Amino acid sequence: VMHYTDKAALPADGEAREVAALFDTWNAALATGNPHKVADLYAPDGVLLPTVSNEVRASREQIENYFEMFLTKKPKGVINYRTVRLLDDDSAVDAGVYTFTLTDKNGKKSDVQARYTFVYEKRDGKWLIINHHSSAMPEV
Amino acid sequence: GVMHYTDKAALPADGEAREVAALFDTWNAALATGNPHKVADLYAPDGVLLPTVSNEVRASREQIENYFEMFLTKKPKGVINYRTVRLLDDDSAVDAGVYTFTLTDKNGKKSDVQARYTFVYEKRDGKWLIINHHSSAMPEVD
């Protein structure tokens, strides 16, 4: 069984770096505890297939609803394994493995490792999430 | 009881979205061959697969083949229950939603597994190839 235990460094230089850094901005949005700030990073037509809900989210209001629940866990993410694939100047895929540190209602911390896909599209100069698929490690 | 997806999706009426949806049918047919090479042929050389039943992310043709060598022994047949299509370039697209596989075991016994999917396609030399496929079990059970 594969486990991913280290932390993926940024490509220190270049345009893979730009795409890769977007996760940092997203992680920071989580830390605000504000679902609207997180939702702001998704395209109005983005699609979220999330870690802990069977409901696929395909509207801003659906996405906000997920984060309204998810953010109560004070989630903090770290990338363990990264691939970046640039499609054109204005679209890219960042996919791999990441780990959330979550806090339960009693303050107890646990880690959940998950695979991720972020598909981004640059619109009017801003990169927005078009697809986010996040899933627990299937072998546990 | 948990949320699930119970119907069979409408393959879209016409256009780019219909062309993108049809790619899944081609992939499902490649499954049916039982030949992992045929399935891998639908992935870009730099495609990335984050598969339903393995922790190991597959980022080479060899690693993709390896996954389907196991997966195809279950005689998997997929059906789309719910679909979204988003067009990026003229040459890239995302098909994402929920599908169900019917699997067949060693002694003929069948079972269905519902999973979320993302396929990210990129058209190169006029041909669509998979650059990302993420497939994942329903997170909630019972």
Side-chain angles (χ1 to χ4, degrees), chain A residues 49-50 53-54 56 115 133-135 138, chain B residues 3-5 24 27 50-53 67 71 77-83 95-103 112-119 133-140:
Chain A
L49 310 91
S53 180
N54 282 5
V56 173
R115 299 88 54 78
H133 191 153
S134 180
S135 61
Chain B
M3 298 303 308
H4 71 144
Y5 292 83
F24 172 79
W27 184 81
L50 309 97
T52 324
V53 307
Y67 185 78
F71 184 56
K77 315 284 172 195
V79 50
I80 304 294
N81 301 115
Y82 167 71
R83 181 182 304 112
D95 186 353
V98 178
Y99 57 11
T100 302
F101 286 106
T102 296
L103 310 163
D112 275 8
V113 180
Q114 182 156 94
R116 303 87 58 78
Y117 74 90
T118 302
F119 291 99
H133 177 190
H134 190 152
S135 188
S136 66
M138 283 312 110
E140 308 175 277

CSV table of all heavy atoms in Angstrom, one decimal, chain A residues 49-50 53-54 56 115 133-135 138, chain B residues 3-5 24 27 50-53 67 71 77-83 95-103 112-119 133-140:
chain,number,residue,atom,x,y,z
A,49,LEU,N,-16.7,17.9,-6.0
A,49,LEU,CA,-17.0,16.6,-5.6
A,49,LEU,C,-16.2,16.3,-4.4
A,49,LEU,O,-15.0,16.0,-4.4
A,49,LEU,CB,-16.7,15.6,-6.8
A,49,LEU,CG,-17.3,15.9,-8.2
A,49,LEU,CD1,-16.4,16.8,-9.1
A,49,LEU,CD2,-17.8,14.7,-8.9
A,50,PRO,N,-16.9,16.6,-3.2
A,50,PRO,CA,-16.1,16.9,-2.0
A,50,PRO,C,-15.7,15.7,-1.2
A,50,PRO,O,-16.2,14.6,-1.3
A,50,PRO,CB,-16.9,17.8,-1.2
A,50,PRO,CG,-18.3,17.4,-1.5
A,50,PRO,CD,-18.3,16.9,-2.9
A,53,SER,N,-18.9,14.6,1.6
A,53,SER,CA,-20.3,14.6,1.2
A,53,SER,C,-20.6,13.9,-0.1
A,53,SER,O,-19.9,14.0,-1.1
A,53,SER,CB,-20.8,16.0,1.1
A,53,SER,OG,-22.2,16.0,0.7
A,54,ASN,N,-21.7,13.1,-0.1
A,54,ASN,CA,-22.2,12.4,-1.3
A,54,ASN,C,-22.8,13.3,-2.4
A,54,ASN,O,-22.9,12.9,-3.5
A,54,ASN,CB,-23.2,11.3,-0.9
A,54,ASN,CG,-22.6,10.0,-0.3
A,54,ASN,OD1,-21.4,10.0,-0.1
A,54,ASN,ND2,-23.5,9.0,-0.1
A,56,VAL,N,-22.8,16.1,-4.9
A,56,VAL,CA,-22.0,16.9,-5.8
A,56,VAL,C,-22.5,18.3,-5.7
A,56,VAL,O,-23.7,18.5,-5.7
A,56,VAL,CB,-22.0,16.3,-7.2
A,56,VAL,CG1,-21.3,17.3,-8.2
A,56,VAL,CG2,-21.4,14.9,-7.3
A,115,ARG,N,-6.9,12.2,-2.0
A,115,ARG,CA,-6.4,12.6,-3.3
A,115,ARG,C,-7.2,13.9,-3.7
A,115,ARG,O,-8.3,14.1,-3.3
A,115,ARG,CB,-6.7,11.5,-4.4
A,115,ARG,CG,-6.1,10.2,-4.1
A,115,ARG,CD,-6.9,9.2,-3.2
A,115,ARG,NE,-8.2,9.0,-3.7
A,115,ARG,CZ,-8.5,8.2,-4.7
A,115,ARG,NH1,-7.6,7.5,-5.4
A,115,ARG,NH2,-9.8,8.1,-5.2
A,133,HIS,N,-12.2,17.8,-7.2
A,133,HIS,CA,-12.6,16.5,-6.7
A,133,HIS,C,-11.6,16.1,-5.6
A,133,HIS,O,-10.4,16.3,-5.8
A,133,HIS,CB,-12.4,15.6,-7.9
A,133,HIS,CG,-13.0,14.2,-7.7
A,133,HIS,ND1,-13.5,13.4,-8.8
A,133,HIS,CD2,-13.2,13.4,-6.6
A,133,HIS,CE1,-14.0,12.3,-8.3
A,133,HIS,NE2,-13.8,12.2,-7.0
A,134,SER,N,-12.2,15.7,-4.5
A,134,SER,CA,-11.4,15.5,-3.3
A,134,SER,C,-11.9,14.2,-2.6
A,134,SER,O,-13.2,14.0,-2.5
A,134,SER,CB,-11.5,16.6,-2.3
A,134,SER,OG,-10.7,16.4,-1.2
A,135,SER,N,-11.0,13.2,-2.4
A,135,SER,CA,-11.5,11.9,-2.0
A,135,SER,C,-10.5,11.3,-1.0
A,135,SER,O,-9.3,11.3,-1.2
A,135,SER,CB,-11.7,10.9,-3.1
A,135,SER,OG,-10.6,10.7,-3.9
A,138,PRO,N,-8.4,5.4,-0.6
A,138,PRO,CA,-9.3,4.2,-0.5
A,138,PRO,C,-8.8,3.0,0.2
A,138,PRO,O,-9.6,2.1,0.6
A,138,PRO,CB,-9.5,3.9,-2.0
A,138,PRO,CG,-8.4,4.4,-2.7
A,138,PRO,CD,-7.9,5.6,-1.9
B,3,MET,N,-27.4,10.1,0.8
B,3,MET,CA,-27.7,10.6,-0.5
B,3,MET,C,-27.1,9.7,-1.6
B,3,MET,O,-25.9,9.3,-1.4
B,3,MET,CB,-27.2,12.1,-0.8
B,3,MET,CG,-27.7,13.2,0.1
B,3,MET,SD,-29.6,13.4,0.1
B,3,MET,CE,-30.0,13.5,-1.7
B,4,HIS,N,-27.8,9.4,-2.6
B,4,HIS,CA,-27.3,8.7,-3.7
B,4,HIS,C,-28.0,9.2,-5.1
B,4,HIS,O,-28.9,10.0,-5.0
B,4,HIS,CB,-27.5,7.2,-3.6
B,4,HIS,CG,-28.9,6.7,-3.7
B,4,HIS,ND1,-29.3,5.5,-4.3
B,4,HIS,CD2,-30.1,7.3,-3.3
B,4,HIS,CE1,-30.6,5.4,-4.2
B,4,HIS,NE2,-31.1,6.5,-3.6
B,5,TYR,N,-27.5,8.7,-6.2
B,5,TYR,CA,-27.9,9.1,-7.5
B,5,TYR,C,-28.5,8.0,-8.3
B,5,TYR,O,-27.9,6.9,-8.5
B,5,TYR,CB,-26.7,9.8,-8.4
B,5,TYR,CG,-26.3,11.1,-7.8
B,5,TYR,CD1,-25.4,11.1,-6.7
B,5,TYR,CD2,-26.8,12.3,-8.2
B,5,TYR,CE1,-25.0,12.3,-6.1
B,5,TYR,CE2,-26.4,13.5,-7.7
B,5,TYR,CZ,-25.5,13.5,-6.6
B,5,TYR,OH,-25.1,14.7,-6.0
B,24,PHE,N,-16.7,9.1,-22.8
B,24,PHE,CA,-17.0,8.1,-21.8
B,24,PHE,C,-17.4,6.8,-22.4
B,24,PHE,O,-17.0,5.7,-21.9
B,24,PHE,CB,-18.0,8.6,-20.7
B,24,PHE,CG,-18.3,7.4,-19.8
B,24,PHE,CD1,-17.5,7.1,-18.8
B,24,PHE,CD2,-19.5,6.7,-20.0
B,24,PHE,CE1,-17.8,6.0,-17.9
B,24,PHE,CE2,-19.8,5.6,-19.1
B,24,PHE,CZ,-18.9,5.3,-18.1
B,27,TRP,N,-14.5,5.0,-23.7
B,27,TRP,CA,-13.7,4.5,-22.5
B,27,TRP,C,-14.4,3.2,-22.0
B,27,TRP,O,-13.7,2.2,-21.7
B,27,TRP,CB,-13.6,5.6,-21.4
B,27,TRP,CG,-12.8,5.3,-20.3
B,27,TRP,CD1,-11.5,5.3,-20.2
B,27,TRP,CD2,-13.3,4.8,-19.0
B,27,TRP,NE1,-11.1,5.0,-18.9
B,27,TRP,CE2,-12.2,4.7,-18.2
B,27,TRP,CE3,-14.6,4.5,-18.5
B,27,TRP,CZ2,-12.3,4.2,-16.9
B,27,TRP,CZ3,-14.7,4.1,-17.2
B,27,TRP,CH2,-13.5,3.9,-16.4
B,50,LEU,N,-6.2,8.9,-10.5
B,50,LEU,CA,-6.4,8.9,-9.1
B,50,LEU,C,-7.6,8.0,-8.9
B,50,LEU,O,-8.7,8.4,-9.0
B,50,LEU,CB,-6.6,10.3,-8.5
B,50,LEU,CG,-5.5,11.3,-8.9
B,50,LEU,CD1,-5.9,12.2,-10.1
B,50,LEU,CD2,-5.2,12.2,-7.8
B,51,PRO,N,-7.3,6.6,-8.9
B,51,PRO,CA,-8.3,5.6,-9.1
B,51,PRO,C,-9.2,5.2,-7.9
B,51,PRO,O,-8.9,5.6,-6.8
B,51,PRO,CB,-7.5,4.4,-9.6
B,51,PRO,CG,-6.3,4.6,-8.8
B,51,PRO,CD,-6.0,6.0,-8.7
B,52,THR,N,-10.3,4.5,-8.2
B,52,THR,CA,-11.2,4.2,-7.2
B,52,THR,C,-10.6,3.4,-6.1
B,52,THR,O,-10.9,3.7,-4.9
B,52,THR,CB,-12.5,3.5,-7.8
B,52,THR,OG1,-12.8,4.0,-9.1
B,52,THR,CG2,-13.7,3.7,-6.9
B,53,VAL,N,-9.9,2.3,-6.4
B,53,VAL,CA,-9.5,1.3,-5.4
B,53,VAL,C,-8.0,1.3,-5.0
B,53,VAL,O,-7.6,0.4,-4.3
B,53,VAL,CB,-10.0,-0.1,-5.7
B,53,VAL,CG1,-11.5,0.0,-6.0
B,53,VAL,CG2,-9.3,-0.7,-6.9
B,67,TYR,N,-2.9,-0.6,-13.1
B,67,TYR,CA,-4.2,-0.5,-12.4
B,67,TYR,C,-5.3,-1.3,-13.2
B,67,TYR,O,-6.1,-2.0,-12.6
B,67,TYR,CB,-4.7,1.0,-12.3
B,67,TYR,CG,-6.0,1.1,-11.6
B,67,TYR,CD1,-6.0,1.0,-10.2
B,67,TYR,CD2,-7.2,1.2,-12.2
B,67,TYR,CE1,-7.2,1.1,-9.5
B,67,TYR,CE2,-8.4,1.3,-11.5
B,67,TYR,CZ,-8.4,1.3,-10.2
B,67,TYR,OH,-9.6,1.4,-9.5
B,71,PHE,N,-8.2,-4.0,-12.4
B,71,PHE,CA,-9.6,-3.5,-12.5
B,71,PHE,C,-10.4,-4.3,-13.6
B,71,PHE,O,-11.6,-4.6,-13.3
B,71,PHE,CB,-9.6,-2.0,-12.8
B,71,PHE,CG,-11.0,-1.4,-12.8
B,71,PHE,CD1,-12.0,-1.6,-11.8
B,71,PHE,CD2,-11.5,-0.7,-14.0
B,71,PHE,CE1,-13.2,-1.0,-11.9
B,71,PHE,CE2,-12.7,-0.1,-14.0
B,71,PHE,CZ,-13.6,-0.3,-13.0
B,77,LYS,N,-18.6,-2.5,-16.1
B,77,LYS,CA,-19.4,-1.9,-17.0
B,77,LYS,C,-19.9,-0.6,-16.3
B,77,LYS,O,-20.5,-0.7,-15.3
B,77,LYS,CB,-20.7,-2.7,-17.3
B,77,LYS,CG,-20.5,-4.2,-17.6
B,77,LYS,CD,-20.0,-4.5,-18.9
B,77,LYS,CE,-19.6,-5.9,-19.1
B,77,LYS,NZ,-18.7,-6.1,-20.4
B,78,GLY,N,-19.7,0.6,-16.9
B,78,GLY,CA,-20.1,1.8,-16.2
B,78,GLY,C,-21.4,2.4,-16.9
B,78,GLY,O,-21.7,2.2,-18.1
B,79,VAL,N,-22.2,3.2,-16.1
B,79,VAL,CA,-23.3,4.0,-16.6
B,79,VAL,C,-23.2,5.3,-15.8
B,79,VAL,O,-22.9,5.3,-14.7
B,79,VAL,CB,-24.7,3.3,-16.4
B,79,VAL,CG1,-24.9,2.8,-15.0
B,79,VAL,CG2,-25.8,4.2,-16.8
B,80,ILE,N,-23.5,6.4,-16.6
B,80,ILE,CA,-23.5,7.7,-16.0
B,80,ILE,C,-24.8,8.0,-15.4
B,80,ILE,O,-25.9,7.9,-16.0
B,80,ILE,CB,-23.2,8.8,-17.1
B,80,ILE,CG1,-21.9,8.4,-17.8
B,80,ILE,CG2,-23.2,10.2,-16.5
B,80,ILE,CD1,-20.6,8.5,-17.0
B,81,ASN,N,-24.8,8.5,-14.1
B,81,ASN,CA,-26.0,8.8,-13.4
B,81,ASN,C,-26.3,10.3,-13.4
B,81,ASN,O,-27.5,10.7,-13.3
B,81,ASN,CB,-26.0,8.3,-11.9
B,81,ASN,CG,-25.8,6.8,-11.8
B,81,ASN,OD1,-24.7,6.4,-11.3
B,81,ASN,ND2,-26.7,6.0,-12.3
B,82,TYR,N,-25.2,11.0,-13.4
B,82,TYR,CA,-25.3,12.4,-13.3
B,82,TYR,C,-24.0,13.0,-13.9
B,82,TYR,O,-22.9,12.6,-13.6
B,82,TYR,CB,-25.6,12.9,-11.9
B,82,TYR,CG,-25.4,14.4,-11.8
B,82,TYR,CD1,-26.3,15.3,-12.4
B,82,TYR,CD2,-24.3,14.9,-11.2
B,82,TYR,CE1,-26.1,16.6,-12.4
B,82,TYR,CE2,-24.1,16.3,-11.2
B,82,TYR,CZ,-25.0,17.1,-11.8
B,82,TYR,OH,-24.9,18.5,-11.7
B,83,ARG,N,-24.2,14.0,-14.8
B,83,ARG,CA,-23.1,14.6,-15.6
B,83,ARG,C,-23.1,16.1,-15.6
B,83,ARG,O,-24.2,16.7,-15.7
B,83,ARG,CB,-23.3,14.1,-17.1
B,83,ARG,CG,-22.3,14.6,-18.1
B,83,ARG,CD,-22.6,14.2,-19.5
B,83,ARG,NE,-22.8,12.7,-19.8
B,83,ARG,CZ,-23.9,12.1,-20.1
B,83,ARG,NH1,-25.1,12.8,-20.2
B,83,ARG,NH2,-23.9,10.8,-20.3
B,95,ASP,N,-15.6,16.5,-18.0
B,95,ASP,CA,-16.8,15.8,-17.7
B,95,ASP,C,-16.7,15.2,-16.2
B,95,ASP,O,-15.8,14.4,-15.9
B,95,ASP,CB,-16.9,14.6,-18.7
B,95,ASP,CG,-18.2,13.9,-18.6
B,95,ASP,OD1,-19.0,14.1,-17.6
B,95,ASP,OD2,-18.5,13.0,-19.5
B,96,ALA,N,-17.6,15.6,-15.4
B,96,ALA,CA,-17.6,15.3,-14.0
B,96,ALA,C,-19.0,15.0,-13.5
B,96,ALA,O,-19.9,15.6,-13.9
B,96,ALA,CB,-17.0,16.4,-13.1
B,97,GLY,N,-19.1,14.0,-12.6
B,97,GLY,CA,-20.4,13.6,-12.0
B,97,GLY,C,-20.3,12.4,-11.2
B,97,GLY,O,-19.3,12.1,-10.5
B,98,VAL,N,-21.3,11.6,-11.4
B,98,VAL,CA,-21.5,10.3,-10.7
B,98,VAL,C,-21.8,9.2,-11.7
B,98,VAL,O,-22.6,9.4,-12.5
B,98,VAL,CB,-22.6,10.4,-9.6
B,98,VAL,CG1,-22.9,9.0,-8.8
B,98,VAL,CG2,-22.3,11.5,-8.6
B,99,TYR,N,-21.1,8.1,-11.5
B,99,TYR,CA,-21.4,6.9,-12.3
B,99,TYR,C,-21.4,5.7,-11.4
B,99,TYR,O,-20.9,5.7,-10.3
B,99,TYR,CB,-20.4,6.8,-13.5
B,99,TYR,CG,-18.8,6.7,-13.2
B,99,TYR,CD1,-18.3,6.6,-12.0
B,99,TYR,CD2,-18.0,6.9,-14.3
B,99,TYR,CE1,-16.9,6.6,-11.8
B,99,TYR,CE2,-16.6,6.8,-14.1
B,99,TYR,CZ,-16.0,6.7,-12.9
B,99,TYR,OH,-14.7,6.6,-12.8
B,100,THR,N,-21.9,4.6,-12.0
B,100,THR,CA,-22.1,3.3,-11.3
B,100,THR,C,-21.5,2.3,-12.2
B,100,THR,O,-21.7,2.2,-13.4
B,100,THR,CB,-23.6,3.0,-11.0
B,100,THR,OG1,-24.1,4.0,-10.2
B,100,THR,CG2,-23.7,1.7,-10.2
B,101,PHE,N,-20.6,1.4,-11.6
B,101,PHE,CA,-20.1,0.3,-12.2
B,101,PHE,C,-20.8,-1.0,-11.7
B,101,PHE,O,-20.9,-1.2,-10.5
B,101,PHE,CB,-18.6,0.1,-11.9
B,101,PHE,CG,-17.8,1.1,-12.6
B,101,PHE,CD1,-17.2,2.2,-12.0
B,101,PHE,CD2,-17.5,1.0,-14.0
B,101,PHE,CE1,-16.4,3.1,-12.6
B,101,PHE,CE2,-16.8,1.9,-14.7
B,101,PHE,CZ,-16.2,2.9,-14.0
B,102,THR,N,-21.1,-1.9,-12.6
B,102,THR,CA,-21.5,-3.2,-12.3
B,102,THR,C,-20.2,-4.1,-12.5
B,102,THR,O,-19.6,-4.0,-13.5
B,102,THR,CB,-22.6,-3.7,-13.3
B,102,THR,OG1,-23.7,-2.9,-13.0
B,102,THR,CG2,-22.9,-5.2,-13.0
B,103,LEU,N,-19.9,-4.8,-11.5
B,103,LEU,CA,-18.7,-5.6,-11.4
B,103,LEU,C,-19.2,-7.1,-11.3
B,103,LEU,O,-20.2,-7.4,-10.8
B,103,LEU,CB,-17.8,-5.3,-10.2
B,103,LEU,CG,-17.6,-3.7,-10.1
B,103,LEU,CD1,-17.1,-3.3,-8.8
B,103,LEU,CD2,-16.7,-3.3,-11.3
B,112,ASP,N,-22.8,-3.7,-7.7
B,112,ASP,CA,-22.8,-2.3,-8.2
B,112,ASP,C,-22.0,-1.5,-7.2
B,112,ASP,O,-22.4,-1.5,-6.1
B,112,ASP,CB,-24.2,-1.7,-8.4
B,112,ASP,CG,-24.8,-2.1,-9.6
B,112,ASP,OD1,-24.3,-3.0,-10.4
B,112,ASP,OD2,-25.9,-1.5,-9.9
B,113,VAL,N,-21.1,-0.6,-7.8
B,113,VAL,CA,-20.5,0.4,-7.0
B,113,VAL,C,-20.7,1.8,-7.6
B,113,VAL,O,-20.4,2.0,-8.8
B,113,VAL,CB,-19.0,0.1,-6.8
B,113,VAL,CG1,-18.3,1.2,-6.0
B,113,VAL,CG2,-18.8,-1.2,-6.2
B,114,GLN,N,-21.2,2.7,-6.8
B,114,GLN,CA,-21.4,4.1,-7.3
B,114,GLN,C,-20.2,4.9,-6.8
B,114,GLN,O,-19.7,4.7,-5.8
B,114,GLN,CB,-22.7,4.7,-6.7
B,114,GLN,CG,-23.0,6.1,-7.2
B,114,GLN,CD,-24.5,6.5,-7.1
B,114,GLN,OE1,-25.0,7.0,-6.2
B,114,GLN,NE2,-25.2,6.1,-8.2
B,115,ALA,N,-19.8,5.8,-7.7
B,115,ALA,CA,-18.5,6.6,-7.5
B,115,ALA,C,-18.7,8.0,-8.2
B,115,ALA,O,-19.5,8.1,-9.1
B,115,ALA,CB,-17.3,5.8,-8.0
B,116,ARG,N,-17.9,9.0,-7.6
B,116,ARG,CA,-17.8,10.3,-8.3
B,116,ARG,C,-16.7,10.2,-9.3
B,116,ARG,O,-15.7,9.4,-9.1
B,116,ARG,CB,-17.5,11.4,-7.3
B,116,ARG,CG,-18.5,11.6,-6.2
B,116,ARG,CD,-18.2,10.8,-4.9
B,116,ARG,NE,-16.9,11.0,-4.4
B,116,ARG,CZ,-16.5,12.0,-3.6
B,116,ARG,NH1,-17.4,13.0,-3.4
B,116,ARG,NH2,-15.3,12.1,-3.2
B,117,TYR,N,-16.8,11.0,-10.4
B,117,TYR,CA,-15.7,11.1,-11.4
B,117,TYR,C,-15.4,12.5,-11.8
B,117,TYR,O,-16.3,13.3,-11.9
B,117,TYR,CB,-16.0,10.1,-12.6
B,117,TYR,CG,-17.1,10.7,-13.5
B,117,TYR,CD1,-16.8,11.5,-14.6
B,117,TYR,CD2,-18.4,10.3,-13.3
B,117,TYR,CE1,-17.8,12.0,-15.4
B,117,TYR,CE2,-19.4,10.8,-14.2
B,117,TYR,CZ,-19.1,11.7,-15.2
B,117,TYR,OH,-20.1,12.1,-16.1
B,118,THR,N,-14.2,12.7,-12.2
B,118,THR,CA,-13.7,13.7,-13.1
B,118,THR,C,-12.9,13.1,-14.2
B,118,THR,O,-11.9,12.4,-13.9
B,118,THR,CB,-12.9,14.7,-12.3
B,118,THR,OG1,-13.6,15.3,-11.2
B,118,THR,CG2,-12.3,15.9,-13.2
B,119,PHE,N,-13.3,13.4,-15.4
B,119,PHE,CA,-12.4,13.3,-16.6
B,119,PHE,C,-12.0,14.7,-17.1
B,119,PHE,O,-12.9,15.5,-17.4
B,119,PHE,CB,-13.0,12.5,-17.7
B,119,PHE,CG,-13.3,11.1,-17.5
B,119,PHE,CD1,-14.5,10.6,-17.1
B,119,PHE,CD2,-12.2,10.1,-17.7
B,119,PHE,CE1,-14.8,9.2,-16.9
B,119,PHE,CE2,-12.5,8.8,-17.5
B,119,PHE,CZ,-13.7,8.4,-17.1
B,133,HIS,N,-7.9,11.7,-14.6
B,133,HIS,CA,-9.2,10.9,-14.3
B,133,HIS,C,-9.1,10.7,-12.7
B,133,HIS,O,-8.1,10.1,-12.3
B,133,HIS,CB,-9.1,9.6,-15.0
B,133,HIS,CG,-10.3,8.7,-14.7
B,133,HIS,ND1,-10.3,7.4,-15.2
B,133,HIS,CD2,-11.5,8.9,-14.1
B,133,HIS,CE1,-11.4,6.8,-14.8
B,133,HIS,NE2,-12.1,7.7,-14.1
B,134,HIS,N,-10.0,11.2,-12.0
B,134,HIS,CA,-10.1,11.0,-10.6
B,134,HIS,C,-11.5,10.3,-10.4
B,134,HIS,O,-12.5,10.7,-10.9
B,134,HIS,CB,-10.1,12.4,-9.9
B,134,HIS,CG,-10.0,12.4,-8.4
B,134,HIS,ND1,-9.4,13.4,-7.7
B,134,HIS,CD2,-10.4,11.5,-7.5
B,134,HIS,CE1,-9.4,13.2,-6.4
B,134,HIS,NE2,-10.1,12.0,-6.2
B,135,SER,N,-11.4,9.1,-9.7
B,135,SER,CA,-12.6,8.3,-9.5
B,135,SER,C,-12.6,7.9,-8.0
B,135,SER,O,-11.6,7.5,-7.4
B,135,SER,CB,-12.5,7.0,-10.4
B,135,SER,OG,-13.8,6.3,-10.3
B,136,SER,N,-13.8,8.1,-7.3
B,136,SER,CA,-13.8,7.9,-5.9
B,136,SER,C,-15.1,7.4,-5.4
B,136,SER,O,-16.2,7.8,-5.8
B,136,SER,CB,-13.4,9.2,-5.1
B,136,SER,OG,-14.3,10.2,-5.3
B,137,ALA,N,-15.0,6.4,-4.5
B,137,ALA,CA,-16.2,5.9,-3.8
B,137,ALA,C,-17.0,7.0,-3.1
B,137,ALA,O,-16.5,8.1,-2.8
B,137,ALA,CB,-15.8,4.8,-2.7
B,138,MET,N,-18.3,6.7,-3.0
B,138,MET,CA,-19.2,7.6,-2.2
B,138,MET,C,-18.6,7.8,-0.8
B,138,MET,O,-18.2,6.8,-0.2
B,138,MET,CB,-20.7,7.1,-2.1
B,138,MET,CG,-21.6,7.3,-3.3
B,138,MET,SD,-21.6,9.1,-4.1
B,138,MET,CE,-20.7,8.5,-5.7
B,139,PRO,N,-18.4,9.0,-0.3
B,139,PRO,CA,-17.8,9.1,1.0
B,139,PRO,C,-18.7,8.7,2.2
B,139,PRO,O,-18.2,8.3,3.2
B,139,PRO,CB,-17.5,10.5,1.2
B,139,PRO,CG,-18.0,11.2,0.1
B,139,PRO,CD,-18.5,10.3,-1.0
B,140,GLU,N,-20.0,8.8,2.0
B,140,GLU,CA,-21.0,8.5,3.1
B,140,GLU,C,-21.7,7.1,2.8
B,140,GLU,O,-22.2,6.9,1.7
B,140,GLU,CB,-22.1,9.6,3.3
B,140,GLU,CG,-21.5,10.9,3.4
B,140,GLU,CD,-22.5,12.0,3.5
B,140,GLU,OE1,-23.0,12.4,2.4
B,140,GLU,OE2,-22.9,12.4,4.6
